[PDB]
Amino acid sequence: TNILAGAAVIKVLEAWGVDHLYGIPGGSINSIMDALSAERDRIHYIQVRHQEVGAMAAAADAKLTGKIGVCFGSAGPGGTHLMNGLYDAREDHVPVLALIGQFGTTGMNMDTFQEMNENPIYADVADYNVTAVNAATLPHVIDEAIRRAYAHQGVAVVQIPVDLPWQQIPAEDWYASANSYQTPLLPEPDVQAVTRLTQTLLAAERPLIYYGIGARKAGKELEQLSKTLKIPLMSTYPAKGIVADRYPAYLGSANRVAQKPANEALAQADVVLFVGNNYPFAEVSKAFKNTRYFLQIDIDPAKLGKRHKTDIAVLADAQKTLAAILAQVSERESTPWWQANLANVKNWRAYLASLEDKQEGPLQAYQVLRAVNKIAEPDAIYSIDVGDINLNANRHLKLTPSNRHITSNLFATMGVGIPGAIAAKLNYPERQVFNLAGDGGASMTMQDLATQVQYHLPVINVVFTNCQYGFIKDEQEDTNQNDFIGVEFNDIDFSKIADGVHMQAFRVNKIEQLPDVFEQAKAIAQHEPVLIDAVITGDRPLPAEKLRLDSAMSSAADIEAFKQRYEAQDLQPLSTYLKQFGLDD
Amino acid sequence: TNILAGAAVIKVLEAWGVDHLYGIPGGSINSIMDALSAERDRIHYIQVRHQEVGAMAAAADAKLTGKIGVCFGSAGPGGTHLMNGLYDAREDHVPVLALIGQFGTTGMNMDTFQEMNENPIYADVADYNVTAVNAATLPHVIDEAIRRAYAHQGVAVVQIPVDLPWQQIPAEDWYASANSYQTPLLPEPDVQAVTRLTQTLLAAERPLIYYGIGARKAGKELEQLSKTLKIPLMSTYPAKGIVADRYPAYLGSANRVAQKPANEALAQADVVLFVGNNYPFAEVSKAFKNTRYFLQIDIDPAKLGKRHKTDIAVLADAQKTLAAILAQVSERESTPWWQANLANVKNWRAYLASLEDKQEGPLQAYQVLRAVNKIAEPDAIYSIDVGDINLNANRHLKLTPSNRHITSNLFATMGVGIPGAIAAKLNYPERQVFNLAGDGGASMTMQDLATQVQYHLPVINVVFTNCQYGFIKDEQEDTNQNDFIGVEFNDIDFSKIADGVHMQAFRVNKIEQLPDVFEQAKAIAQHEPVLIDAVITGDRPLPAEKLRLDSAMSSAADIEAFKQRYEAQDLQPLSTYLKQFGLDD
Amino acid sequence: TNILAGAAVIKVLEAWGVDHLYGIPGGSINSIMDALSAERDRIHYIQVRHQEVGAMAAAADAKLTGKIGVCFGSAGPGGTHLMNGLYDAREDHVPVLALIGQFGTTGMNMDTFQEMNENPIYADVADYNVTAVNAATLPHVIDEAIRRAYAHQGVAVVQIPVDLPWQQIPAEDWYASANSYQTPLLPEPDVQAVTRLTQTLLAAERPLIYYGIGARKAGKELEQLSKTLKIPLMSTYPAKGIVADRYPAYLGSANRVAQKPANEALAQADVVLFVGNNYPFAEVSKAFKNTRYFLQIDIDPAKLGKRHKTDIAVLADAQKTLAAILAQVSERESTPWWQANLANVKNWRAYLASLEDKQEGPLQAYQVLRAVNKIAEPDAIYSIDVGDINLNANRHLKLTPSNRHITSNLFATMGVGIPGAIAAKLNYPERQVFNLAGDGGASMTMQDLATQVQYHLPVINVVFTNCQYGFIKDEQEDTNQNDFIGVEFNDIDFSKIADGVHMQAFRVNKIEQLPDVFEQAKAIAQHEPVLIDAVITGDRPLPAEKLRLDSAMSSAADIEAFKQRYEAQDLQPLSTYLKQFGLDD
Ligand SMILES: Cc1cc2nc3c(=O)[nH]c(=O)nc-3n(C[C@H](O)[C@H](O)[C@H](O)COP(=O)(O)OP(=O)(O)OC[C@H]3O[C@@H](n4cnc5c(N)ncnc54)[C@H](O)[C@@H]3O)c2cc1C
Ligand SMILES: Cc1cc2nc3c(=O)[nH]c(=O)nc-3n(C[C@H](O)[C@H](O)[C@H](O)COP(=O)(O)OP(=O)(O)OC[C@H]3O[C@@H](n4cnc5c(N)ncnc54)[C@H](O)[C@@H]3O)c2cc1C
Ligand SMILES: Cc1cc2nc3c(=O)[nH]c(=O)nc-3n(C[C@H](O)[C@H](O)[C@H](O)COP(=O)(O)OP(=O)(O)OC[C@H]3O[C@@H](n4cnc5c(N)ncnc54)[C@H](O)[C@@H]3O)c2cc1C
Ligand SMILES: Cc1ncc(C[n+]2csc(CCOP(=O)(O)OP(=O)(O)O)c2C)c(N)n1
Ligand SMILES: Cc1ncc(C[n+]2csc(CCOP(=O)(O)OP(=O)(O)O)c2C)c(N)n1
Ligand SMILES: Cc1ncc(C[n+]2csc(CCOP(=O)(O)OP(=O)(O)O)c2C)c(N)n1
Ligand SMILES: [K+]
Ligand SMILES: [K+]
Ligand SMILES: [Mg+2]
Ligand SMILES: [Mg+2]
Ligand SMILES: [Mg+2]
C-alpha cells in the first residue's frame, strides 16, 4: 500500500535506464543512500573520493552514451564540490542530474550545522534548480528534472531535505515518464536552399568544409563530398575522428589546439561551409575576416548567423543536409587549390612523424603519443585532460570513426582525464580506455586513481610530467613582460602516487624505454588499471597560430629560430605549395 | 568610416523587423534614446507612463504576432519596474528583449548615484542576461539576445553602460543575423504511433479531445475530428476560440476559469487525447484520476508524460498529427455519450443566455459581456486582465477563429489589460480592440490610459467595478475562518480617471443603460479610445469547480441553496443526460 | 494546547511593535490574511492598490521612525510588484520585512498555476531570503528575518507556502526575541585622533564641515561649531534640515540637487571635515580634487577612506565626536573666508526669494513651493518624489530640525511621494504631511491616492505638472545630439484623477491663484486628503553644476546667456566676494 519516497525515487532512476551514479554519502543524504542500498542489484552506486570527480564522470557518461549522467553530494561542501563537473555539463550541453543533500524540513532555516539555503548556489549552472518540500511529489520532481535535463541538454539540480525520502507515500500514485521519452525531431533541409548552397560551394575558387560535432553522424558524407568535389576538410578539435585522421585532405583544426594546414588554408579560403559547428574562436581570432561567402548548416536556430554573417543558412540536420548536397553533385577534376592543400598536409604529417619516430634520447610528449598509438586498439576511447595534451593529442592520435575521445571542450576544466576514463570503462568494459593527462591536471584529481583500483576499472593512465603548467607557461612567454610565475613547479612521481593507491605503474624518462613499458601496460590493462608517468622535456610544441616559415611574412632570423626550436627545418609554408600550383597567396 | 554603436544597435532592431518598442528615458539610457531619436521614421518609440506597462506590452506584442517584443528601462528603478511584464513573458514563453540602462563604465563599481551591479537583478527571469562592456561588440550582443529570445522563447536582458552607445565603431564590421532566421521543416508525424493512438481513441466509450494553444493551427481538424467521430471537445482557457464557441460539442475549459460541461465530462471520460496542452491544474486537481488511457501529442520533449502517466505520447506538430488522424478515420454514428454531452452543453448555454438576456435592473458582469458581444466585430481582439473577468469572459465571449484574446496565462499578473490592448492596437490598427479589466487590475495600470490617448489608439476599455478583489473574496469565502480582509474597498470612478487623461468615457450601473452607451463607445472607437466603467453587483459567479446539482453526490439542501445563489434552478447535472441516453454515471 | 502557525506569526509581529503593514491579498497568502483578520485590534492592515506602494510605504515607515516596515505580496506578480520599494529599502539601508505568498507545499515544484521557485527572485535585494518549509519553525523564521533586517539595516524576505500558516503548532513553543533588542553603548570617541583632527581643521585657511544624515543627531553641535569657529556648513541633500535652512552659513548641498554656494565653496576649500556622509558623487565629480586635507568621522568601518584619500578617519558616533571637538575649541574671530561665504549665501537667497516672490503671471515651480512654505506647520513632514522636485524642494523649502523630509535617496525610484506620505500620516496622525511630486512620478503611483481616501489620511498632495520628465529633458539638452525624445508628453489633470478617487482637489496655472487654493487645502487637510495640481512652466531651474557667472572662468557671452535664461542677472560668483574680503580665487 505504501512505499518509501526514496525507494520510489530510485525506481524513477531505474525506469530512466540509469545504470550507475556517483557520489559520497553524508548524514544529509543518508536517506537516499538507504534507498540505494536496497537497490544495489539493479542500480550501481560508485563511491568517488572527491565529488568533483563524480560530477565530471556523470558529465562524461552523457558525453559518451547520450544517457543522462547522475551524481550527488551531501549538503554544503559535498554539493559545492560538484561544481566543476556541473559547469562542464552545462557548457558541453549534456544532460546531468545532480542531487544535493539538505537538512530535514524541521531544521531548515534554523541556522543549524552545515544548514544553509542551498538553492541560490546552483541557480546559475542549472537548467532546473529546485528544493523539494514534499515526499509524495518527490518522484515527480526527480522525473521532471530528468526530462528537462534531456530536453534542454543541461543540468538539473534537486536539493532534497533528508527527511523526505524516509517518509511513506502511496505506492500506486507515483510514476516515471521514461516510457514517453523521445529525442528532438530532426529538421529537414529546404530543397531550394540546399541547391543554392551547393551552387555557391561549387563556384568557390578556394572552398573548405569546416565541421564540428554537430556533424558526428555525417562522417561518410563529409569524406565523400571532399573526395568527389576536391574540397579539403577541416574541423573543430572535438570533431577529430569523425573523418579518419588518415584521410589525405583532412587539414585538422584551427587556432591553437590546431594543425598548421587548417590555419593556413582557412586564411586563404573564399567560401566556407560551416556545418554543425560552434567554434568559439571565430570572432576573436577574425577567422573569417577574408571569407567571401559563409554557408551554415545547424539544427539550432540560436546558432544561425552567430559566428559570422551567413549567405545561406540551413536549419536542418547535418547528415540529411550533407546527403542532399552529395546527391546533387558529381565528380569534379582536381584543382590547384586541392593539390596545394594535399601537398601541405603531406609536409605537415611528415613533420609530425619525424617527431614520433625518434628512437632514443630525452623523452618528449610526441614519442609518448606514438607509443600510445602503437598499443591502441582500433575502437579505443580516450579521456583527455586539459593543457598541452589537447594540442599534442589532437596532432598525434590516429583516430577513426571507431574511436571516441572526450575532454572538457568549452568550460575546459582540468582534472577531467581521470573521471572521464572511469566513465568510459563503466560504459564500455570491453573497450580499451586511456586517460591522457598533464601533471597539473592529473594532480587535481589524483585521489580518484583509487576509484579505478576499487572498481577494478582497467584504465591506461598516461601522465605527461613536465613539472610545468606548460600551456600557461607558453602564454606567459607570449604576453607577459616580467619573468615566468606560477608555471614551473616541483616534481610529483605519479608512479609512487599509483603505488600509494595500489595501482601498478611505471615511470619513464627516455624514448628507448617506451616500447617495453607500453607493452607491459597494455597487458596489465586486460585486467587492472595501470599508470605510466612519462617524464618529458620542457620543449614548447610548435605554435600553429604563430608560424614563422614564410619569407613574405617573417625575417630570415625569426624563421631560423622557429625551425631550430621546433625541429621544423623541413616544414614549408602553404604559400610554397600555392606557388607550385600557380596560385597567389 | 564609423557609426555610433547606438545607431548600429537600432539598425540591428530594424533588421529584425521591430516596428515599435516601449520605455521611459533616463540619463542612464539617454544614449540609446539619442539613437532612437534619429530613427523615428523606421522604428516607433512608445513612451509609456510606467515601465511595467512597456514590458507587458512587449510580451503582448509577441503573444499576438510571434515577433519579439522590445522594451527598456533606465538604471535601477526603471528596469525593476519591468519585472511583472518580464515574468509574464517568461511564463507565457514568448520572446522579449529588455534593455536596461546602466552608469558609464568609468563610474561602475564606484557606488555612485543609482549605480549598482544590475546583472543579478535579472538572472532569474532571463534566458540570456548580460552586461555589455565594449561598444564594438554591442551590436552583436543585441543580435545574440534577439536570436536567443526567439530560439528559447523567453526573455533576453542586456544591461548597457550609457557611454558605450555614444562611442564610434567601424561602420563595416557589425551585422545582424535576422537574414538567417527561419522556421524548421519537420518530418511526418510518426506513422505507427499515430495509428496506435488513433485505435485507442476510437475504442473508447467516453472519449474527449482536450487541447491547448499548441493546437492553435488545428482548429479545422479539431472540429472535423469531433464531428466525424462524435467526440466532444474541451480546451484550456487560453485555447478558447481556436474552435468557435458556437460549436455544439465544445464543452469549455476545466477547473475554475471553466465551464460546467467540461468539468463534468472530464470526470467521466475513459480516454483523453491531450494535445498541445500544458494544463497546470492537472496533478493538483487530480483531473485525470478516473481516466483509463491518456494519449498525448506535443512538440516539446520536455512535456512528454509530464502531466499524467501517458500510454502513448507522440512527439509531433499538433495540426499535422490531427490531420493524419483525420485521414485514417471516417464517420461514426452518434453515440449516447455524444448525445448526453450535446444536451448538457445546450442546458449550460441556456443558463448563460438567461443571465445575459436580462433587460432591466442592477447591472451584473453577465449583461456587460452580452453588451460587448453585441458591439464586437468578428475579428476583434481582446486584452483581458486577471480576476473574475477571466472566468466571465471565458463563459460569455462568443469567439471564433477570427478573434484573438490574450491575458497573462500563467504568471497571471493583474494590470495586463491596458498594455495588451495598447500592443494589440499598435499591431492591428484596423482591428477592433477591447481591454476587459476588473477594477483592481485596471487600477494597477490606470496611468497608461494616457498612453492610449497620446498615441490615439482607439481601444474600447471596459472596467468591471465591483469595489472588490472579487476573485480573492470568493477564495476567502471558501477557505478562511475569519472575516473577509483586503477584498472589499472604496470606489474609483474610472469615467473620471478617463476624463483626467482626456479620454471620453461613461459610467453605467443599470442593465437598461447598456445598449446606448455601448453603441456610443463603438462609434467613438472608430477614431479615439473610450472607457466604460460598469458598476456591477457583488454576485459570485457560479463555481464550476463546486457544483451542487446531482442528487447522488449532494444533499437536497445543498442543491437548493446552490440553485438559489447562482440563479441555476434550470441547470441539470450531466448525470441526468447520461441517464436519458442510457449511460451510468 | 495549540495555536495556528499564522496566529503565532502575527504575535511575533506584535511583539516587535509593528503597528501597521501593507499588501494585497491573494489565494497564495490567504492564510496570513486569515491570521491578520483575527488581530485587527492590535495590528493594522493597510490594503494598497499596487504592491509597490506597500513596499515603498514600508521603507518610508522605517526611514521615519527607525522601526521595521512590513509589507507583503501574493505569489508571483504580487511579490515582484514589491521590487521598487524593496530596492529602495536596500539602498537607503532601512529595515523592511517582506512576506511573499507561495503555493502550498503539496503543489510546489509541480508547475501548477502561478507556482514557481520564488527564492531566486529576491536573492539580490535581500539581506535574508528564505522559503519556509515547516509550520512549527515559521514563527522563528519570521523572528529571525526581523532581527536580521534590523541588525543589517536592510530587507528580509520570507516566502511562505500557504498551507503552513493554517497548521496547528504547540502553543508553548514559539517565541519572539523583541525583548532582547537593544542599542549599543559606545566608548568615548578616540581622544588622540579627535584632538589631531581638530588641529588640522583649525589650521585650515578655507575650512568646510560637510555632513550627511549620519550627523542627524548632531544639529546643535554642527551649528555651534560653525558659529564658534567661523566655518561654513554644507550637507548632502538628504541632510537638509538637520541645521535650519535659515542658518546664515548653511551653504546647501553639492552637485545638481544642490545650491550654488556649496558647489562654489567646495571647489575652494583646503580642508573638509566629512561627517556621517556617503555622498555618492564624490569620485565621479572629482569633488575633492583641490582639497589639501580630508578628515572623516563615520560609525561604519566600511566607509573609512571610502570616498577620498583620508588624512584622519575617526571611527565614532558623529554627535559624540562633534561634541568632543566643541569641548576643546573656543571662539575664533570672523575671517575673510567666513565673510565671503556669508555674502555669497545672502546673494543666493535673494535670488531664490526673487523667484518665489512673484505675485502674478505664469506659474512656476518656485512660487508653488513658496505657497507650500506659507501653509506649512513648523513640524511638517514632506514626502518628496524624484525629479526636478528634489532640486526645487532642496532650494525652496524652509526646514528646521522639527521637520522631516524623505525621498528615495539613492535608488531614486519615482513614485515614492504618495507612499511616503501614507506612511508619514500613519505614523504621525497629528502632524501635517505633504506629498510633493512631479507629474511623471505622481502618475506612476496615482492609484494609491485612493488609499489616502480609504484610510482618511489627510495628506496635502502637490503635483507639479510640466507635461515633461523635466529632469531628464534637461539631461538630454546637455548630452544628446538628436531631438528630445520621451521627455515631453500629454497632460493629465490630477484634479480629475483626485475626483475619480473621491479626493477634493484643485488645479491652478497662475501665480495669483495660489494663496486662496493653498489656504483651502490647508483647511481641508485638517480632516481629509487634498490634491493641488499645479500647472507649471517648462523653465529649466538654474544648474548649480553649470554656473556661468565668473568672468575669469566663462566668456561674457556665456554669462549673459546664463543670466538671461535663469533670471540670474543679480547673482554674483563667489570670486566677487572672495575678492571683496581680500582672498584670491
Ligand atoms: C584547452 C583547450 C583548448 C581548445 N582550443 C581549441 C582550438 O584551438 N581549436 C578548436 O577547434 N577547438 C578548441 N577547443 C575546443 C573549443 O573550446 C570548442 O569546444 C570547439 O571548437 C567547438 O567544437 P564544436 O563546434 O564541434 O562543438 P559544439 O560547440 O558542441 O557545437 C556543436 C554544434 O553542432 C550543432 N548541432 C548539433 N547537432 C546537430 C545536427 N544533428 N545537425 C546539425 N548541427 C548540429 C549544435 O547546434 C552546435 O552549433 C579547445 C579545448 C580545450 C580543452
Ligand atoms: C486568473 C486565471 C485563472 C486561470 N485558471 C484556469 C482554469 O481554471 N482553467 C484553465 O484551463 N486555464 C486557466 N488559466 C490558464 C492556465 O494558467 C494555463 O495557462 C492554461 O490552462 C494552459 O494553457 P495551454 O496548455 O493552452 O498553454 P501552454 O501552457 O502555453 O502550453 C502549450 C502546449 O502546447 C505545446 N505546443 C506548442 N506548439 C505546439 C505544436 N505546434 N504542436 C504540438 N504541441 C505544441 C507546448 O509544448 C505546450 O505543452 C487561468 C488563467 C488566469 C489568468
Ligand atoms: C533625483 C535625486 C538626485 C540627487 N542628487 C543629489 C545631489 O546632487 N547632491 C546630493 O547631496 N544628494 C543627491 N541625492 C542624494 C544622494 O543620492 C545620496 O543619497 C546622498 O547625497 C547621500 O546622503 P548621506 O551621505 O547623508 O546619506 P547616506 O548615504 O545614508 O550615508 C550616511 C552616512 O552616515 C554614516 N553614519 C550613520 N550613522 C552615523 C553616526 N551615528 N555617526 C557617524 N556616522 C554615521 C553612515 O555610515 C554613512 O556613511 C539625490 C537624490 C535624488 C532622489
Ligand atoms: C581547474 C582549472 N584550473 C586552471 C585552468 C587554466 N589552465 C588551462 S591549461 C593549464 C595548464 C595545465 O597544466 P598541465 O596539466 O600540467 O598540462 P601541460 O600544459 O603542462 O602539459 C591551466 C592552469 C583550467 N583550465 N582548469
Ligand atoms: C499584480 C497581482 N497582484 C495580485 C494578484 C492576485 N490576484 C489574482 S485575482 C485578484 C483580484 C482581482 O481583482 P479585480 O481586478 O478587481 O477583479 P474582480 O475579481 O473583482 O473582477 C488578485 C488580487 C495578481 N494576480 N496579480
Ligand atoms: C521608476 C523610475 N523610472 C525612471 C527614473 C529616471 N528618472 C529620474 S527623474 C525622471 C523624470 C521625473 O519626471 P517628473 O516626475 O515629471 O518630474 P519633473 O522633473 O518633470 O518635475 C526620470 C524618468 C526613475 N528615477 N525612476
Ligand atoms: K584533489
Ligand atoms: K500604477
Ligand atoms: Mg604540466
Ligand atoms: Mg474587482
Ligand atoms: Mg514632470
CATH classification of the domain holding A208? 3.40.50.1220
How many contacts, defined by CB atoms under 8 Å, are there between A and C? Answer: 65
C-alpha cell at position C493: 489633470
Using CA of residue A478, residue A481, residue A483, residue A486, what is the dihedral sign? Answer: negative
> Among all residues of chain A, which has the CA nearest to that of B119?
A124
Among A377, A339, A319, A373, which residue's Cα sits nearest to residue A248?
A: A339
A323 in any annotated domain: yes
CB contact (8 A) between residue C486 and residue B33: yes
Atom of ligand 1 nearest to the CA of A235: 11
Among C230, C193, C238, C216, which residue's Cα sits nearest to residue C332?
A: C230
Which chain C positions have a beta carbon within 8 Å of B33's beta carbon? 476, 480, 485-486
Vertex C152 angle, CA C146 and C156, to 5°: 40
Q: Are B180 and B201 within one domain?
A: no
Atom of ligand 3 nearest to the CA of C237: 11
> Among all residues of chain B, which has the CA nearest to that of A320?
B187
Q: How far is the CA of A387 from the centre of ligand 4 (A)?
A: 5
Smallest Cα distance from B358 to chain C, Å: 29
B581 in any annotated domain: no
* Contact assessment for residue C171 and residue C3, using Cβ atoms and an 8 Å cutoff: yes
B565 in any annotated domain: no
Please give the span between the terminal C-alpha atoms of chain B, in angstroms, as a whole number.
Answer: 79
Q: Are B138 and B231 within one domain?
A: no
H/E stretch holding C3: strand C2-4
Q: How far is the CA of C440 from the centre of ligand 6 (A)?
A: 6
- Among C110, C111, C130, select the one facing A109 at the smallest CB separation: C130
Q: Are B387 and B331 within one domain?
A: no
* Contact assessment for residue A418 and residue A53, using Cβ atoms and an 8 Å cutoff: yes
C-alpha separations of C237 from B384, C225, C251, C415, C543 in Å: 44, 20, 11, 19, 15
Smallest Cα distance from B182 to chain C, Å: 30
H/E stretch holding B559: helix B556-565
Question: For residue C157, what are the β-bridge partners?
Answer: C98, C129
Amino acid at B576: T
Residue that finishes a domain, picked among B124, B149, B184: B184
C-beta B26 within 6 A of ligand 6: yes
The CATH number given to whatever domain includes residue C482 is: 3.40.50.970
Helices (H) and strands (E) in chain C, counts: 21, 19
> Among all residues of chain B, which has the CA nearest to that of A124?
B123
Q: Are C360 and C217 within one domain?
A: no
User: 3-state DSSP call for residue B356?
Assistant: helix
H/E stretch holding B556: helix B556-565
Smallest Cα distance from A169 to chain C, Å: 12
Among C199, C187, C150, C182, which residue's Cα sits nearest to residue C317?
A: C187
Q: Are A137 and A20 within one domain?
A: yes
C567 in any annotated domain: no
- The set of residues, in sequence order, having a beta carbon less than 8 Å from that of B85 and lying 6+ positions away, is B52, B53, B54, B55, B56, B57, B58, B59, B71, B96, B413, B419
Please give, one letter per residue, the 3-state secondary structure of B298-349: ECCHHHCCCCCCCCEEEECCHHHHHHHHHCCCCCCCCCHHHHHHHHHHHHHH
Amino acid at C333: E
Q: Is A283 on the interface with B (CB under 8 A)?
A: yes
Among B32, B33, B89, which residue's Cα sits nearest to residue B58?
A: B89
Q: How far is the CA of B94 from the centre of ligand 5 (A)?
A: 23
- Which residue's CA is minimally distant from atom 11 of ligand 5? B469
CB contact (8 A) between residue B454 and residue C23: no
Among C184, C238, C243, which residue's Cα sits nearest to residue C63?
A: C238
Smallest Cα distance from A578 to chain B, Å: 29
A125 in any annotated domain: yes
Strand order in the sheet with C207-211: C233-235, C207-211, C271-275, C293-298, C312-315
CB contact (8 A) between residue C129 and residue A144: no
Which chain B positions have a beta carbon within 8 Å of C502's beta carbon? 490-493
C-beta C417 within 6 A of ligand 3: no
CB within 8 Å of chain C, chain B residues 99-158: 106-107, 110-116, 120-121, 123-125
Q: Are B212 and B179 within one domain?
A: no
Amino acid at C351: Y
* Contact assessment for residue A411 and residue A96, using Cβ atoms and an 8 Å cutoff: no
Amino acid at A101: G
Q: Are A115 and A228 within one domain?
A: no
User: Whole-angstrom Cα distance, residue B73 to residue A270?
Assistant: 43
- Which residue's CA is minimally distant from atom 5 of ligand 5? C78
Residue that finishes a domain, picked among C147, C163, C184: C184
- The set of residues, in sequence order, having a beta carbon less than 8 Å from that of C565 and lying 6+ positions away, is C540
User: Whole-angstrom Cα distance, residue C246 to residue A314?
Assistant: 74
Please give the span between the terminal C-alpha atoms of chain C, in angstroms, as a whole number.
Answer: 79
Amino acid at A23: G
Q: Neighbours of B (≥3 Cβ pairs closer than 8 A)?
A: A, C
Which chain B positions have a beta carbon within 8 Å of A187's beta carbon? 184-186
- Taking every pair of C-alpha atoms in chain B, what is the biggest distance, in angstroms? 85
Give the CB-side neighbour count of residue A155, counting CA atoms within 13 A: 29
Q: How far is the CA of B376 from the centre of ligand 5 (A)?
A: 25
User: Whole-angstrom Cα distance, residue A245 to residue A402?
Assistant: 12
Q: How far is the CA of B514 from the centre of ligand 5 (A)?
A: 25
- Among C87, C476, C480, select the one facing B76 at the smallest CB separation: C87
- The set of residues, in sequence order, having a beta carbon less than 8 Å from that of A568 and lying 6+ positions away, is A351, A542, A549, A562
Which chain C positions have a beta carbon within 8 Å of A141's beta carbon? 109
Atom of ligand 3 nearest to the CA of C92: 30
Q: Are B171 and B193 within one domain?
A: no
Q: Neighbours of C (≥3 Cβ pairs closer than 8 A)?
A: A, B
B570 in any annotated domain: no
Atom of ligand 5 nearest to the CA of B471: 19
DSSP state letter for B42: T
Residues lying with their CB under 5 A of ligand 11, a single-atom ion: C 438-440, 466, 468, 470
Ranges of H-type helices in C66-179: 77-80, 83-91, 138-152
Please give the span between the terminal C-alpha atoms of chain A, in angstroms, as a whole number.
Answer: 79
Among A451, A481, A484, which residue's Cα sits nearest to residue A470?
A: A484
Question: For residue C100, what are the β-bridge partners?
Answer: C73, C159
C-beta C387 within 6 A of ligand 6: yes
Q: How far is the CA of B525 from the centre of ligand 8 (A)?
A: 24
- The set of residues, in sequence order, having a beta carbon less than 8 Å from that of C323 and lying 6+ positions away, is C218, C221
A576 in any annotated domain: no
Angle between helices C191-203 and C318-326 (to 10 degrees): 60
Q: Are B3 and B98 within one domain?
A: yes
Total structural domains within chain A: 3
User: Whole-angstrom Cα distance, residue C174 to residue C196?
Assistant: 52
DSSP codes of every residue in A18-54: --EEEE---GGGHHHHHHHHHTTTTSEEEE-SSHHHH
C-alpha separations of C68 from A203, C29, C48, C62, C146 in Å: 74, 21, 18, 5, 7
Q: Are B472 and B488 within one domain?
A: yes
Angle between helices A336-356 and A365-375 (to 10 degrees): 100
Q: Which residues line ligand 1 (CB under 6 A)?
A: A 212-214, 236-239, 253-258, 276-280, 297-300, 303, 317-318, 386, 390, 407-410, 412
C-alpha separations of C380 from A228, C90, C376, C403 in Å: 89, 26, 6, 5
DSSP state letter for A130: E
CB contact (8 A) between residue B185 and residue A185: no
User: Whole-angstrom Cα distance, residue B16 to residue B563?
Assistant: 56
What CA dihedral angle connects C304, C309, C311 and C313, to 10 degrees? -10
Q: How far is the CA of A234 from the centre of ligand 1 (A)?
A: 12
C-beta C213 within 6 A of ligand 3: yes
CB contact (8 A) between residue C133 and residue A137: no
CB contact (8 A) between residue B301 and residue A189: no
User: Whole-angstrom Cα distance, residue C181 to residue C139?
Assistant: 17
User: Whole-angstrom Cα distance, residue C459 to residue C422?
Assistant: 7
C-alpha cell at position A493: 612521481
C-alpha cell at position B2: 564609423
User: Whole-angstrom Cα distance, residue B376 to residue B539?
Assistant: 25
Domain assignment of residue A35, given as a range: 1-184
User: Whole-angstrom Cα distance, residue A324 to residue C391?
Assistant: 69
C-beta C229 within 6 A of ligand 6: no
- Among A183, A188, A304, select the one facing B181 at the smallest CB separation: A304
Atom of ligand 5 nearest to the CA of B438: 15
C448 in any annotated domain: yes
> Among all residues of chain C, which has the CA nearest to that of B255?
C113
- The set of residues, in sequence order, having a beta carbon less than 8 Å from that of A41 and lying 6+ positions away, is none
Give how far the C-alpha of residue C471 lies from the chain's centroid of Cα atoms, to the nearest Å.
17
Question: For residue B25, what are the β-bridge partners?
Answer: none
Smallest Cα distance from C317 to chain B, Å: 23
Q: Are B390 and B340 within one domain?
A: no
Residue that finishes a domain, picked among B184, B215, B237: B184
Q: Are C363 and C502 within one domain?
A: yes
